[model samples]
Target: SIPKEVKVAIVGAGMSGLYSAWRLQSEANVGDLAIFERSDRTGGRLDSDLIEFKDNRAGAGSTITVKEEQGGMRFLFEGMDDLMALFLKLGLEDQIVPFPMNSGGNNRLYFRGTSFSVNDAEQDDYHIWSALYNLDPSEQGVNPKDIINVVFNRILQVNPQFDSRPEVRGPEFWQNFRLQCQWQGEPLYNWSLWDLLTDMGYSQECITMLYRVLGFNGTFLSKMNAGVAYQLLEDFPADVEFRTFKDGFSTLPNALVDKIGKDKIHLQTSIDSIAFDKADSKYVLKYTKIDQSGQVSEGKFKAEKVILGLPRLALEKLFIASDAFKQLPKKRRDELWDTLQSTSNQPLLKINLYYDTAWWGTGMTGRPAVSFGPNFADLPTGSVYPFYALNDELAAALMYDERHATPNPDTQHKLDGIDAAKYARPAALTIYCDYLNINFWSALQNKGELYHHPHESELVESIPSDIFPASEAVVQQATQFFKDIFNTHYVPQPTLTSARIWEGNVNFNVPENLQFGFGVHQWAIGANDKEVIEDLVEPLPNLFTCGEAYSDYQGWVEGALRSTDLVLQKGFGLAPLSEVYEQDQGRSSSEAIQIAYRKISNKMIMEYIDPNFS
Candidate 1:
C-alpha cells in the first residue's frame, strides 16, 4: 500500500527518526510526511519491552529512571534556544530533576578490602567520589582553583611517594598528569591499581580498594584510550543523572509516535528493497507483510523523498537500484559502518534480578547499586567484587559484567559427541554477588536438567522473523552470573521465585557487536560525525539526520535533541527553540560565529549552547 505523494518517508522509529518526524510535523510546512518502521513498534532504540519481576512489570533492554543527576551527560546547544525550550514546552521541566551538591549527606566511597571510606571532610575541599571519579570542579559548580588544591592535597595524603618524584617537583607535570591521568585516562584499565598509586603517590591499599569497588570489569586497560579515560575522570566533579518517563523511557518515544499519528506512520511493515527511478525522479520501495503463519504478503511504496534510518549494516542488505550507492567507496562508508563493527560499540547484555525481599541493605547505607563480576558472585561477602549494584529500595540489584568464555574443549567435544548438555558448565558466580547482595543464589530445573532460561526467548528460529538470536541466552547468563554470586547451591523453590529480568525496545546486539546505546565509540563525543551522517544521509531535500548518530554527543537522550536542532536548521531554516540552545547550541554556524570561539571548545558542549535560545 504505497502512497502517491509522500513528502518524506523516515525509515527508522528510534529517537533520531522520531525526533526528526516530530520536528517536521510541528515546525515544517511539509505535507504528507510519513514514517516507515521496519519493526512493529515505533520507538527504535528507545523501546520498552516487558519482563515480569515478582508479579511486578519491569523493563527489559533499558532502565526506567536514573536516581542521580548527570552533569556530563547533558548536552548544551548554542543557537537552538527555541529548540532548547522544548523541554519546558513539552512539560518535561518537572521531569528534569537537579542533582544536589553534597546531597548524599556524608556519603563516602567504599574502599574495597579495607575497613575505610573516602569522604570530603577528611581532606579540606575534597569530596569522596568527586575526587576519586575525576569530576571537574567547575562543572560540578565548585571552584576549580580550590578543587586543584584539594586533589593535590588528597593525592599527597594517599601517597607520600609522589612527594619525591622529579615530575611531582614541577607544576607543569603535576597539572598535566593530574588532568591526563585523573580527568582523561582510563587509569584503572591501562595501569594496575599499583600503577595509579605509584604515579599519584597514593596508598597502594587505598587504590586497590577503590579499584575493587569500581569493578575494573576486565575491560583491557591497554585498549582504553586517553580520550575515553579523560571522560571517565570527568565524572568526578560533573553530576551525570539518568531519567525516564513515569510509564517508561519507551513512553517518550511512544508519545512522539502518537503526535506523528497513525496516518503518518505504520507498524508491522517490512521493507525488502529500495530502488531509485532516475527517469521518474522517485524512490520505489518493495516490501512484504509478515503474517502469523510466517507468510509474506506483497506490498510496495513509492515516494519522491526517502530517509533510510536503518543502521548502515542493515541498510546494506536492502536492494538499492543504483550500483553506485551499493558501490560507494569503502573509505566513504567506513565511518558509517564503524559503529556497528567497532569493539567498543558492542551491545550490552543487561540482566535484572528480582526477589520478594529487599536483599541488600537500604539507601546509601546499603551496598552500591552497581557491581561488576567476571564469574557468578565468586568473591567473599563485603570483599568488594565488581559489576553489581543495589536499587533505591534495596530490594533488587543491577549487575554489569562482561560475557567472555574461552572455547570450552569439553563442551566442544561433547557437542561433537551429541551430548545434550555438552555446552553447560557450572558457571563461577561468586565475586559479583558477594559485593552487591548477601543472599546471592541460582535456579533449579523444572524438568529433567532443562529449565526455562530467562533470556532463552530471544533466540530466533528464523532470520529477520525473530528479534535476535541467543540474545535471551545472554540475558539468562547475566542473570545466572548475578544469582550465583548472590547465593550458591540454592535453587529457587517451585513456589518461590528467584530472579527477574528487564528488556528494552532495543537489545544491545552483542553478537554482531553494535553499540546503539552506550559503549566506547558510541560515547566518544570527540569522534568524527561523518560516520553518523553517511548512514542517515538521503538524497531528498529537507530530509535530515539527528539523534546520537548525528550529533557529536553519541550516547545520551540530550544528544538526540541536539541532533533534532540540526535537522530543524538544515531542513526548514527554523532556529532551535530556547531549550535547544540553553543546554547546547544547535548545529548552526550562525550561532557559533556569533559566540566567542573560546566560549565553546568542546564540540559536545557546543551542541547545547544556543545563545539566542538561551
Candidate 2:
C-alpha cells in the first residue's frame, strides 16, 4: 500500500527534517508527506544510549545503569528559544533540567603539571599571573569571563568604530557585518581565529592559553574560519549556562516522532539517487530499504518537492550521487559543492566508562568534571568527569543500555526521588576527544598496551575502525590518565560496558574529503561571506537545504531549528521569523525573548565581564 508518489519528500530524519515535516504536515496531505531516515533510529547527531550494568554491575546495590549523550549534550544561551518553544509545545516542560548552580565540584581544568578548579578560582594567584603578563588592570582576573573580556578588548582596539555602530547591534546586521569583513575586495571569512588574533597583535602565550582555557582544538587554529568562530563565541558565550532534559536529550525528538506519527517516517531507508523527471515535472528518488536483519530491498519514490535535511558531508554525498545535480551549470554546482566541501565536521570521540562507585566524589577527586591538559597520553585534548555529579540523576537515567536492550522506564521514574547521598556506585565518566586527537587515540587501541574488552569486537564493525578504539583499551587508558593527573593509586579501573564513538563508523555516507568530525562549520581559507550568503539565498527550484551547516548558529540544536525556520519562511512562505517568534511568545513571554535578544545584542560586539570578576 506504499504510495508511488508524494507531494513532498523529506530526506534524513534529523531534527531539521523532523521540524520541516512537522511544519509542512498541516499544509500538505498526511499521505502525501513522507520522511526518509537512513538509520534505524531518528534524532541524527542527538544520539543517546541507555546502558544497564547487569553483568558488571556497579558496586552499589541498586540497579546501576545510566543514559549517555554521545552527541549534542546541552543547550546553551537564550537563542535556543526555537527548541525551548518546541519542548513546551510537546508538553515536555517537566523534562527541562538545569545544572547545579554554585556547585564547588563543577568543571576542573588540568593543564601542564597542575589542575585548577573552574568554579572555585584562587583570585590572588590569578592577579599575580595577570600582573606578570602585564595585562590591563581591567583584564587582571583568572576566570574565563576575564580572559574573554581581555581578548575582546584587544579585538576592539584593532577596530574601535565597530562598538559605536548601533545599527550593527540589531538582528538585521549580520548581512552588513558579513560585508564589513570584506575590506579591499577580500572578506575575512577565510581567515582563521588564530590569524585574526595575530592580526590584532595578540601574543603567542595569550593565544595558546586562550585556546587551552576555551577548550578549542589547537590543530583547527588555522583550519576553522574566523567569521564562524567569532559568530559562535558572540552567539553562545563560554560562560553561558547549559540545560538538558531529565530523561535524555533524545526526549525532544522522540516527542516529535510521537506527534508526527510513526507511519510517515520510514526508518532504515536510504535514498540512493535523485533525478529530475523533466517530462513529468517531478523528482524521481531511488532508495533502498534495509530490514533489521540487514537485508536490503530497493524502491523508487517521486515528489514535487524535496527537503534535504542532512549535514554538510551527507548532503555532499547526495549531490555527488544525484544526476539531477550533475546536470546543473558548473558554476551553480561548484558554489554548492565548494561550500559543502569547506565546512569541516571535525573528528570527535566520546567514551563513557561505568564505575563501581562515585570514588571521585568521595575524596578520590575534588571536582566532578576535570579537563585534561594541552597534552596527555592518547587523549591529546579533552576532559574526563563523573557524569552523575555534573548533571545529577538526569544524566544517570538517560544513558543508553546495551545489555538490557531497552532503557528501564520504571527506573527513570525512581531517579527523581533518589537522594544524592545514596546515589553512589554505578557512576559514569566521559572521555571526550575532539579534532585530530580522536585519530591519535584511536590509533593507539591496537598497540596492545591498553586492555581490549570482548564487546569491542562486536561493535567494531558497527563503527569505522579508524575512529573507534577498543572498549577495554579506552577504559584502561582513561584510568591511567586519571591516576597520572591525580598522582594517586586510589584511581580504579572501570568496567567498560559500552563505548559510543560518534564520528567513527557512522551511518552517514560522507565522502573522504568532506569529513571534519564535530565542531563549528568552516569556510574555505580563501572563500568569502558573499559565497556563503548566496548559497542560503539562492533557491534551487523544488529543493531546500536545512541543517546546522546552513545556519549562522552552527554545531548547536538552535542552528538546526533556525535553519528549518529559514526554509519554512523562504521555500514554503508559510511562516515569517516574526510570526514564529510570535507563536513562541504564547509559551515564553516577551521578557524571556528580550533577555536572550539583549544578551546577544550586547555580548556580540564586546565582552560582558561578570561583576564578581573585578
Candidate 3:
C-alpha cells in the first residue's frame, strides 16, 4: 500500500532533512510531504545512546550511567540565532545547558615527551622550554597570541591582496568584498591555507600549533580554500559560547520528530535513484525498503519537488545515480561534478569508554580537566581528557563517578561516606581522532587486529595483546596514554561502550558500521564563486540540495538551518528564516550580519593587537 505520489519528497533524516521537513510542513499540509531515512532511526549524526555499566566483580559494587553522544556534540551561540529561535519556538530553551567553559580547568599539552600545563606555560609567553619555531623567543614572545599575530602579520605581508585593502567596517564590508572578489576574479578559491601559510614563511610545526590554538586542523590544510579559512579566522575572535542540550544533543531532533508526527517519516527506506518523469511532468524517486529481517523491497514515489539534505559523500552517490543530472548539458554536468569533487569528506572517529571508576581525575592534579596529547605522530593526532568530576552537579548525579550502586532508577542510591570528588569509577571518556588518524584506525580495523609497526611501537606495547578487536586496541591506547599522563600504573578496565565512524553511505547501501555525513564543507581550490552560485541554483527544476555543506558556516548546526532557509526561499518560493527575523524582530539581514562581523573583527583586533582595543 505504498503511496504513488506526494507534493514533496525529502531525503536523509539528518538535522538538515528534519529541519526541511519541519519547515515544509509549516508551509504545506502534512499529507503532502514524505520524509525518508535509510537508517533504522532518525537524527543521523546527532545520535545519542544511554548505557549503564555495573561492576561484575564480587564486593565491588558500582553502577554508572553514560550518555554516549555519537556526533555533533556542541554548537557556538554567536552565529546560531536561527537554531536558537527554533529552540525557543519548540519551548526547549530551558533544556539548553551552557557547557562548563570556565570550570574545565586548564588544558594540558603533551608534545614531544614534554608534559606541561597550558596555563603555566602561558606565564612566560609560552616559552616553556624554547621557541617551537626558528624565531628567537627573546626578541618576540613565544606566547600563542604572539605567535598567532606573527603568523597573521606575515600572511598580510606575503599576500598583499589581503593587506592592501582599507578596513571597511560593518557587514557591508564582507558582503561587498565577496562580490568584488567575484567580479575581479580574485584567487581566494584557488589558494589553500597551506599555500598561504607556506608562502608566509611558516613551518609545519608553526602551522600545526596554530591550528591547535585556533581549534581547527592543519592535516587537511591544503584541501581547505583560503576564503573559507579567512572566514573561519575572521570569526575566531568573537565572544562565541558553546552549548549542548541538557539531556543530550539528540533532544532537538526528537522534538522535531514529535512536531512533524512519526507517521510522515518512513524509516529503513533508502532512496535508490531519482529521475524526471516526462509522462507526469514530475520527479520519480525509486527506493529500497529494508525490513527487520534485512530483506529488501523496491518502491516508487512521484513528487513535484525533492529536497536532498545530504552530506557531500551521500550527495555524490545520488549525483552519480541521477538520470536527470546526467541529462544536463555537458558544461552543466562538468560544473556540478567539479564542485562535488572539490568538496571532500573528512573521517572522524569517536570512541566512548565506560570505566568502572574515574581514575584519571583523582590520580592527577585535581585542576586540569582536559588533556591533549600529540603523542601518536601518525594516527590519533591527539587525546582529550574530559574530567566530568570537576562539576559538583555532574558528579553528584553519577554522570562520571561511581557514587551510585544500582542501575534501576528507583533503587539507585549514593554510596554512603564516599567522597564524590575523589571517586573515579562510573565515567565515560571520549577519544576523538580526525583525518589521517581516522584513516589509520579504519585501515587497522579493516585488518581485524593490531599489527606491530615500528613507528607505533609505544602504541602497540600499550595494548595487552594483538588478538583483541581493533576497536578495543583504540581503547587500550587511550588508556595507556592516560596512564602516561598521570604517571600511574592503575589502568581501569573499560567496557568499550561505543565506537562511531562517519563514513557516509555508498551507492545507496548503508553499511553495518555507524555512519555520519561530512561535518564541514571544503571549497574547491579554484572554484569558490562558481561552486557557491551554482549550488544556489536548482540544478534541475524542483530539485534542490540543503545541508551544512551547502552553507558558508559548514560543520555547525547553524549551517544546516541556514541552508534549509535558502532552499525554502529560492527553491520553494517561500521567505527564508533570515527574512522572518527581519519581519518579526525588525532585525535586517545586514544588521545581523553586521553584529556577527563586528564580533569577529573586534575579537581579532583584541587578540592580536591590543586587549583593550575593543
Candidate 4:
C-alpha cells in the first residue's frame, strides 16, 4: 500500500537508503518518511548467511555452522571511518572484530599452474614468485604491488607538496590534486590503468601478475580509470588492518534497519513508474507490492522528495523499463544518464566452503600457526579467503545434546560417536571471482566433468538456493578450484553452504557489469566522477540518486554513505549531526575538503581550491 504523502521517499532500503532515513529522522525533524525495498529483506548487497557446515568429518552424523557472505565481507578500519563510526552509533561497537588480513608468512599463491607460498621475508624465496613471471630484468625483482606503486608515485612526485599534509587530509587530497594534472594534455582520468601500465613499458607478464595480486574481479584492466586506480592505491594503504563484524557484514545493515524503525521500511515493494504531478507540488510514485507469488497490489505515493538508493543496474532498468525516469526532458534526461551510467555494475561471485577441521589454518598441522589472510589464485578462483579465530564451540556443544538426548541415546553414548572435543573446532575458506571471472566460474561446469570425491553426500547440494545453488559445473570447478590452488587432491569435498554470483539484486537487462564492487568497483574510464557525483545528487529537482555508483569511493559502504551524506545535506537540507562534520572539523581546506564531505556540499565552492572526492 502507498502512503498518502511522505516528506521523503527512499527507493532502496540498502545501507545508503537506511542511512539517509536515519540522518533525516535524527537530524532533520522530518517525521513523514518511507522506504520501499524491492526485496523482502532490507539489507542490500550486504549478505551474511549464517549457514550450516554439513561436516561428515572422520566420523558419521556430522555438521557445524559458519557464516557465508554472499556479498560484502570486510572493511579497512583505517580508511573507512564512516562505517566504523556508523557501527558505533548503532551500538554495535562490541560486534566489531579484527579481521587479520596479513599474509603472516605462509600465504598461498598459484601462477602458471605452479603453487608457492607468499612471504616477502628476507630470504631467497621472497623473490621466487616474481621470478616465475616473465618480466624485464628491472621488473624481475620488484614486487607486483610495489611496481604498481612506482607507476602511480610518479604522478605523486609531480605535486610533491600535498604529500606532506597531515594523515587525515587523506588520499582524496592527493587524488583531487592529481586529476587536475595532465600527462601531455591528457588528464589522468582519461588514462586507463591498462593503457597507462603498458605505455609505461610494463611487460605483459608483469601486468598479469599485478592483476592477480590485485585479486577480486579481474582488475577492470583497460576499463578502469587511472584516477580510480590511484585513489584506491592511496586510500588502501599497505599492511592496513582489515576488520568485519564478529557476526557478519550483514549485521551492519540489520542494525541500521532496526535503528530506522522497521515500520518505515516497505519490503517486497517496487516502484513501477514515477511522474511529477504538476499541480500537487509533489512527485508522484507508482509502486507495486509483490507477494509470495506475484504482484499483490499497486498504489500511488506523492512525495516531497524521492531518493533512489539504487545501483547502476537497478537504475538502468528503471530508466528504460519503468516510467520513473522517462518524464524528464530529453536534455535533462540525457545529462542525467551521463552521470548515472558513469559507474558500471561490477559483479562478484563469492563461494564459501565449510569443513570440520581448519586445514590450511592452525587447527591442522603443517600450516601457518598464527592467523593469516586470504589466498590469491591467478585463475578463475581469483582470491581464496581463509576465516580464522573461531566460532564453532558454541554450536558444537549444542549438537552434542542432540547426539545424546537424555531419555535413551540412539546407540548408547557411543552410537559410533567419538569425543566431541576432537572435532568441535571448524574452519572454512571462500572463493571470489570478480567481473569476467564470474563468467569463467559460471561457465566452468560446462568445461567438462564436475569434480567428485570419495567422501561426499549423495543428496546434499554444494550451494544453498536462498543464495545460489552452483551448477554442477560451478560446483565441480569451485570444489576443484580449491584443489588446484592448494595443489592437492586429498582436500575434502565441501558441504558448501552459500554461494552468490552477485546476480541476485542485479538486473539481467544491463549488458555489462563493470567496476561494480570492490572485487567490485564503480567507474567509467575517462569520465570526471566528481562532476557526475554532484550532478547525480539531485537529478531532477526533488529526485536524487544516492548509491556508491556515483561516488568516488565506489564499492565501499562509505562510498554509499558519502553519496547519501550529499543527499541528506544538499538535497534535503538536513545538515548531518556533529558526526558528519566531526571528521573534517579541524583540517586544512584542501585536505579536509577531500574526505570530510560535510565541508563541501556545494560543488561550486569546492572548485575554488579545487577538491577531488575520488
Pick by lDDT: which candidate is best? 4
Candidate 4, position 202, lDDT: 78
lDDT by residue (tens digit), candidate 3, 1-614: 34689888889888888988887787644458888898778887787655545544455635444454667777654456677667655766555444433222245555545555556656665575355444433324566545554554544455545433644222223323332332124455566667666655666666665555443453335476665556556643423345566566888999999989888888889787899999889999889898779888998889998988887777778888888888888998887877777555656656666554565544444545432122222225344534232233442232222211233432223322233343454555666666545665565454445423333332112322101223556656666766654445766656444566666544436363344565456555655444464574466789888777656555667767877777887876767665576677676544554454345444443443334442
> TM-score for all predictions?
0.52, 0.77, 0.78, 0.81
1-614 per-residue lDDT for model 2 (tens digits): 24688888899888988888887775433447889987767887777655544424334222344555666777743555577556655666555554322233344556555544544345665653454345444444665445555654544455544443552232234433443554324455656777766665656666565665555453336465665565555543444445566556888788888878888899878788889999999988988887767777998979988888877667777788998889989998887787766556655666666554655543456435332111222235365544552334333322211012332455433532342433354566666666646665565543565454456433222332212334455666667777654444667665444444445344558532223335435444555544564465334778878777666556678777877777776777766433565674654422454354344323321232111111
Pitting candidate 2 against candidate 3, the one with the higher TM-score is: 3
For each candidate, the alpha-carbon lDDT, in order, equals 0.38, 0.58, 0.59, 0.64
Order candidates by lDDT, high to low. Answer: 4, 3, 2, 1
**Top TM-score: which candidate number?**
4
Model 3 scores a TM of: 0.78
* Candidate 3 residue 607 C-alpha distance from true site, Å: 36
> In model 2, where is the ten-residue run with the lowest total lDDT?
605-614
Better of 2 and 4 by lDDT: 4
Model 4, range 1-614, lDDT digits (tens) per residue?
46799989999888899988887887687779999987677677787866554555466445455665777877754556566556555666545454556544677777778776666322563477556777778786656677777766676666454353556544366347446755545777787777777887878877777777777533446366776766765555555545666678889888778778888989878776777787977888887786667648888879989999988766766777545467667887787777666765666777776665655543443444423466787788888886532343222222232222342353234322322233344556778767657777655533555444344453243433355444556666666766666655556655444455664244346322211223355566767776777788887778888877677576678788777888888876765333554654543222332333222222322342113322
Kindly indicate the candidate among 1 and 3 with the higher lDDT. Answer: 3
